[PDB]
């Protein structure tokens, strides 16, 4: 049972690797291995400093492995210390905040985007006094610095790139050399990506996959010679590191050494090196999903896999006896449940008594189901899979029977009648092939007579339907009410409040129930009769709103409602779309609120049980007759038992499968699954962590060689995150002093954009900050570390300014301040481009294509878009899918103007740009940030410059998690532009003017790219 | 920066050790040293399997490290693994649930008492297939098993024993060994205590320190020949351990080697190994203490040492600018506040204001400080310290004033009246010097004219003195309402509710404003005057019950209620005594709650705010005008950040300081602590962890060779307590099945005395288990792993019984169950007693002489005291105070009877004894115990049976805790007998007649002791 070997530094006859998520540490002449560092958290890279005797190491903490620091260990004396608190954002794909290099003195030297308004400003800082000072490089954004002769050796974007094989777009690894003190040449730019630079004697050796897989090559000084060293084939080697003789790396699990002199390879024999116990135990709310109503009041949910039935206080608790992967599971009978069960093969429908403890599975295979209900008589359950189809199967015989597939999407809100008879569900479809919306309509499925019938028109999105107790009405939601809502900053409306409740007898002549004709007034009788339906639709005199579930019941509709809200956060931060469940009086036509604060709500078969999940994160129940009586449901009473090994293989063989079935083609997608799959499942039991089976799963992941392979969310460490506190201020160390180097503020008026000192009437630039609550800082006190234990309250803060200034004030520490440091970064390139424009030049940044970057661009946008000309920076632009939104806007073309009585001219459009318009992109602009260049291009809105873009363009939609949570993501959708095809992926979009943007240019003040913008505009605006 | 090195094994030339809680590797070869398993938990012990290839560890978990288990460490593969879930109690000084040696096959055998009705029964079990299965060696406690020749050895009670350096109570270390396959032979019995036995070829090796300092020591298998082979001075050895070739042993921080051939000592060299971060981060809430009101809304609280001035919310947070150990904080003024800051000097006051950040602390030492308060014009604070002195401090020029000083008791009972004029304070006091009872009288200083005046008579106990607003009338509590209240189980009477207020107008001729005399009726006016004011107290018309404060206010009466409980939780739990909050109306005379679950309550000075704890251990503040704006106050939002070093140093002086200031004997206490005090301070730098710190403080408690000098609670890991599942049953795997080798069930019909499967119908004794939940238990899976993770929850159990019975029952899975073992062996040997008696002798057991002895005196007692003869067992009594209760019910002597008309006989007093008594005691019995087993001989009661008691009599009444929480405990009573005077400390009390319990007596299954004890009666009964 050996284990993974990874990343590895060299000095002499010492190696230091990671195992475990631990630093380790191996000698070659004695042959002997030891664990040096262990329990600090998830490390992923050490380096040795150049006397060998003390150690950098980068660890990772939180859940998701989402923030990072720096610690130093000593050889020495076995001491630890933590040198950065700056809390660096990470991701699997961006390990950023990390050891860069050694300067000539023996000093580290970092690569941090920790002080930077974009995570890919990865600036390099030399560290003083083990993390009391930072002092800036200014060579711009890098990732390894060498220094070779007396001069500086950059690596840019040079960190490996595991989950895409292949990758050739513009932020692909380059390596610049300074040629003379001050001014420097990029000497390789291949046309794959380069990693891990390292120098031994007068080369640079580095990996790339140019010729088809991973190897080492090397160049001399000058870039030129090139020569390849290796001729790998089962792994992709990683990790390159020297002591300046000998190299050191690592390849799928072992330790290899390279000796550059007779170009000799070896792999280092380390053996077993540590075992933990495969047992372990979960707290099941960390992993719960699918919680649901039983008889009994009994509830059932599922976590990591496994599926429960317990009563409400969780005291009481059975575990479903079926091995891994129940998806969904719902209540079949008194005291019986039907259940998904997923394998490698798909999900099968199963079926549990837990009362006589007979387990039954039906071996249909469903293919992948992402919906599933059963009749309240128990005779059927109805399913839903990625093949779009809804289907019934016999829960005795087990049989399968397909009611209707769409051709769109997948067919998951569908209701059952009480008496079994009726099957409603939403219909997605198109009227042709390529429209750009798809619609839903309502349908029917008699099971007597099995014939579907139409409930609703395709002109919209009908939804939610529900029957009522007596199965003689079907109500349901649509987003028909059309009335636009004005936007209040830009001249704009939407549609807000639009869902209405509709019914629809389902006996013709009968009368809408909620219109209360009465009874004497009415010829009753009637068959069922389901043919046009929808002629008879009538609405529910309920105002318009956002409704997301409609219950009919015998006196009264309970309607599950969402208040108009902002998307920031739901789109940023998972926060859940917050609810409130309401009840509509039949009767009266009164409203009421019967339960707020919800993000989620089942009903009991019975219509007599509500379950509910509030934004608080817990579950809970209460009658639908007296929801003052509200129980909250444990689930943590009882552990969750399960065995490592046997969750990491089902973790690979799912991850693999879902890269197979989502990758957008098909075709390829079948060569390539099975070409890789031993090759990776063969390294899952050397994984004994959550991070091992990561750096596996990435590396198969990366195979498809296409953009947006993503490992997303998991639980890798129990370890809290790293703390980092904030007030949008730089410090200096001068003296014995810290001196505030700089104040952040955008815009004053707006909330969030400026150090907090500034409420107070100053601004802090230049004074000196003597200490915070009470403890002196400077020196001898690191300030970050101090920070850090304020962070997320306030502090009572010393400032001196230069003469007889003092200031005594209470500080609110932020535990983060890089939207404050964007908006400064902004409105400083604002200024700028007007000072330099004099006046006559525009500016707007727009750092994605998510609801920040709509938030930006228009922020901008009603005060930038009527000078003469207009500069539209995309750089470091993160993507989304609001690209088409704001070239829509750039498009529109000034072509009149109102002339007031009183007052100025009104342009026409409004949302026009009057003037010239040039837009800037780099390497680090990608995905809908690649589309939108593409387009501005082809649109001709006019020129681009900077630099390729990062060619990414094959989108991701995730719909399933691994059992501990994380989010995979597959490149499911390729774009493809008319007349270039495909060809944007994996290569970016050239600019109409290449203008790099040097180390050099860093280090003047310089950005070359805004300047040759505005004056390239300048030029333009002459005539 | 060396480390404190400890407990280490030996096998050629790899040495293993302790250091930093964790295990770690030497080889003498190599010299190399590395940490082998970390993160574990607390390691106290760890032994080499005798083939060198595994490693058997012991390690602790839970906060106070109260729980530990064991596991094994293969360093072929580097597997961990956990070998037992029985979660076993331990304490610093009984460290239980351990290795005990191995036996000639290699097997594991075990020492513990996890499966016993009482911590000192640590049986031996031999352990097979990694803790599925424990064999039962049958030799009754032991904590040592060596082999020889084919011969058992066995060490009794021989772990080390440092906290009580010359010890030779009859509880000391003790070696048998076998003569005759089954027969035992005790062959090392010394004065003093023999621990850590080792055999190197036919010499059994171990520590004792029989000539005043621990030494290394051995004897031949017969335990003769003994000879003396070290002569330590400055740290006893300790842990001795052996590969059967050389010794290996810890002293003062270093590993040392002892080789028996040459008898040379070498020390081995192994340097600095880890210095984790020094600068520690804690929550507030865990370690907090004096919470108090201030002006402004601010709330005032101290924890681990520090004091902060904060929002109710928490946000806004000041910590006092003073270095460690601030005892007290109180409200001083506006934005000021007066504070005791304790130093290695002894106590002092200071103040601070939090608005101009000027803090100033006075130089007058006030000694140890208890108690502080501050009139409410800031002129003065009031102080009480353990001179038994009650003093006021001037504010301005710290000059302190002594009011009065009890010889009895600390004055820590004071209130100050709002004009500053009066200090009223509860006076201890006694008659005579050897009183049995402590008096209160309330005393009142008047500050204008100095003199002292008393306000109650001396004849009760006075308490809780409270002045009105308008310095009027000096309200008060007594407990002079004597009621008798009469008890359920037993004849006998006592005072529960006889607590009562009282209120004494300070102005001759006015009435007590309660009873609402009318103004017009009374003639007012009249100057103050103290003289004869006990006369003049009148009580106020509220019913007796049990109060501890009273607050008057302009319309009502506020009263601290605490309603009539068990103590049986607070006593052994540390469960906080209930209270609420009640509101007199004067007018009305109705009495309202207005807050309940209170444990504590604060009042502002202005009266206006109220601050509580409550029963959830939260705080909370409401306004006394509305009691329904109640907020909770959060004080963890800022993490709590300290230095470690400094935390240790201040530690180990505070628990120096406190062994020498309490130690029972003043005269040797200046000796002994100024001869201890460099060599184990010199130890402090080496400790890196609470663990380390704790070895090196009880080292330097034991200096004081008397018993009871303890250390409990603190933190020492962040680790959660081992779980172990339990249903009170034994099992024994059979074959493939784990079958129930016996069910306990004390009496059926109390509540928790037996097995949970009792309740649905059938003893599962001989049933067969099935399944866990589902899970099959059984050859090949553990069944207690399977129980531990289903600890405090119902889980399905399976049961086959020898038929075609099948039992499946949702069984309660206990978290513990040593209880019902107890009453099951108590109720056994009740049983065993009326047999072998014919019913002519009845039995008794006293589990401690603490609550629970209390409880399980009388509840056998007024079952069995009317037999001919009656055995009182207090085998393994644990010790408390309530002997002399249970003694002078044992001494009623029956003179008569009560004849009537119908029924039976009624004895005279009811609380008779029938006939004739015989006491069992064994070394187990202890402190409390050894004063019953003294008296019982001394008083005539009966004969003494059993061994040699335990041997400490030297009280405690701890009254400081470190700022971890920690609570050492100082000798600080010495028991004095007559005729026999301090001589049972270190000795114990011999019986009338000794009874061994042999090795070979516990292979039998025979008890000799309760079988003499019988035999014994039998004869005496005869005549």
Not at 852 to 868: A, T, V
């Amino acid at each position: 049972m050996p284990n993974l070997l990874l990343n590895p530094d060299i000095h002499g006859d010492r190696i230091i690797f990671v195992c475990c998520d631990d630093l380790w540490e191996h000698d070659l002449k004695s042959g002997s291995t030891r664990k040096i560092v262990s329990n600090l958290g998830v490390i992923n890279n050490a380096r040795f400093f150049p006397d060998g005797r003390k150690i950098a190491i980068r660890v990772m903490r939180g859940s998701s492995l989402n923030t990072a620091d720096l610690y130093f260990y000593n050889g020495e004396n076995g001491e630890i210390k933590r040198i950065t608190y700056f809390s660096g954002k990470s991701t699997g794909r961006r390990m950023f905040t990390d050891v860069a290099g050694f300067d000539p003195d023996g000093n580290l030297i970092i690569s941090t985007d920790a002080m930077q308004p974009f995570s890919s400003m990865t600036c390099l800082y030399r560290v003083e006094n083990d993390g009391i000072n930072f002092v800036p490089l200014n060579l711009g954004p890098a990732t390894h610095i060498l220094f070779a002769d007396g001069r500086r050796v950059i690596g840019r974007n040079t960190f490996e790139l595991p989950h895409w094989k292949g990758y050739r777009g513009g932020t692909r690894g380059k390596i610049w050399i300074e040629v003379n003190s001050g001014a420097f040449k990029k000497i390789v730019d291949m046309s794959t990506h380069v990693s891990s630079p390292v120098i031994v004697g007068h080369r640079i050796y580095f990996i790339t996959d140019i010729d088809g897989f991973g190897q080492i090559y090397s160049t001399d000084l000058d870039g030129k010679d090139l020569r390849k060293h290796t001729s790998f084939t089962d792994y992709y080697p990683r990790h390159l590191n020297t002591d300046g003789r000998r190299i050191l790396f690592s390849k799928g699990g072992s330790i290899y050494i390279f000796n550059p002199d007779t170009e000799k390879i070896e792999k280092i024999e380390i053996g077993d090196l540590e075992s933990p116990e495969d047992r372990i135990i979960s707290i099941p709310s960390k992993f719960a999903e699918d919680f649901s109503p039983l008889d009994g009041d009994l509830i059932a949910f599922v976590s990591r896999g496994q599926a429960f039935i317990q009563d409400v206080s969780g005291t009481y608790v059975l575990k479903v006896p079926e091995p891994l992967r129940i998806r969904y599971v719902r209540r079949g009978g008194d005291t019986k449940v039907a259940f998904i069960h997923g394998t490698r093969e798909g999900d099968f429908l199963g079926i549990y008594d837990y009362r006589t403890g007979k387990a039954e599975k039906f071996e249909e295979n469903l293919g992948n189901v992402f919906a599933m209900g059963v009749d309240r008589n128990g005779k059927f359950a109805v399913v839903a899979n990625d093949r779009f189809e809804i289907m019934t199967v016999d829960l005795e015989t087990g049989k399968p029977t397909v009611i209707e597939r769409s051709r769109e999407a997948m067919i998951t809100d569908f209701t059952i009648s009480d008496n079994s008879r009726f099957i409603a569900y939403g219909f997605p479809l198109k009227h042709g092939e390529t429209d750009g919306y798809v619609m839903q309509a309502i349908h029917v499925y008699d099971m007597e007579g099995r014939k579907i019938f139409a409930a609703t028109t395709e002109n919209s999105h009908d939804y939610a339907p529900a029957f009522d107790a007596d199965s003689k009405n079907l109500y349901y939601l649509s987003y028909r009410s059309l009335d636009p809502s004005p936007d209040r900053v830009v001249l704009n409306f939407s549609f807000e409040v639009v869902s209405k409740p509709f019914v629809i007898p389902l006996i013709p002549g009968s009368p809408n129930p909620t219109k209360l004709v009465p009874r004497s007034m009415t010829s009753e009788a009637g068959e069922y009769d389901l043919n046009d339906m929808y002629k008879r639709s009538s609405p529910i005199n309920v105002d318009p709103g956002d409704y997301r579930m409609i219950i009919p019941l015998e006196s009264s509709i309970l309607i599950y409602s969402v208040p108009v809200h902002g998307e920031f956060a739901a789109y940023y931060q998972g926060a859940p779309e917050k609810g409130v469940l309401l009840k509509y009086d039949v009767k009266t036509r009164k409203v009421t609120e019967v339960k707020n604060n919800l993000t989620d709500l089942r009903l009991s078969a019975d219509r007599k049980t509500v379950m509910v999940r509030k934004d608080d994160g817990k579950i809970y129940t209460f009658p639908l007759e007296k929801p003052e009586d509200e129980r909250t449901v444990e689930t943590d009473k009882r552990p969750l038992v399960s065995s490592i090994h046997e969750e990491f293989l089902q973790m690979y063989d799912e991850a693999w499968k879902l890269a197979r079935d989502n990758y957008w083609n098909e075709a390829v997608a079948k060569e390539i699954s099975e070409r890789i799959y031993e090759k990776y499942r063969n390294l899952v039991p050397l994984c004994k962590t959550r991070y091992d089976l990561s750096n596996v799963i990435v590396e198969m992941q990366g195979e498809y060689r296409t953009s947006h392979s993503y490992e997303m969310g998991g639980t890798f460490t129990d370890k809290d995150p790293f703390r980092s506190g904030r007030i949008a201020c730089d410090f200096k160390l001068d003296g014995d002093h810290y001196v505030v180097a700089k104040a952040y503020a955008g815009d004053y008026s707006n909330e969030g954009e400026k150090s907090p000192i500034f409420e107070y009437g100053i601004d802090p630039t230049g004074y000196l900050i003597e200490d915070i609550d009470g403890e002196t800082v400077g020196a001898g006190s690191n300030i970050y570390r101090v920070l850090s234990e304020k962070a997320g309250t306030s502090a009572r803060i010393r400032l001196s300014g230069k003469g007889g200034d003092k200031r005594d004030l209470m500080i609110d520490i932020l535990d983060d301040d890089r939207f404050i440091r964007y908006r400064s970064w902004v409105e400083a390139n604002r200024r700028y481009v007007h000072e330099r424009s004099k006046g006559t030049i525009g500016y707007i940044h727009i750092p994605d294509m998510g609801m920040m970057g709509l938030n930006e661009f228009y922020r901008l946008f009603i005060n930038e878009s009527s000078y003469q000309g207009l500069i539209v920076d995309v750089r470091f632009n993160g993507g989304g899918f609001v690209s088409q939104l704001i070239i829509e806007k750039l498009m529109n073309k000034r072509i009149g103007y109102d002339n007031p009585r009183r007052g100025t001219l009104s342009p026409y459009p409004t949302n026009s740009v009057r003037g010239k318009i040039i837009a800037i992109t780099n390497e680090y602009a990608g995905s809908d940030g690649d589309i939108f260049s593409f387009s501005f291009k082809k649109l001709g809105l006019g020129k681009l410059i900077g630099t390729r873009t990062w060619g990414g363009v094959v989108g991701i939609t995730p719909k399933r998690r691994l059992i501990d949570g994380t989010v995979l993501t597959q490149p499911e959708f390729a774009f493809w532009f008319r007349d270039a095809g495909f060809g944007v992926e994996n290569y970016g979009v050239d600019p109409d003017v290449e203008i790099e943007y040097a180390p050099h240019d860093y280090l003047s003040g310089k950005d070359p790219q805004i300047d040759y913008a505005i004056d390239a505009l300048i030029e333009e605006l002459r005539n």
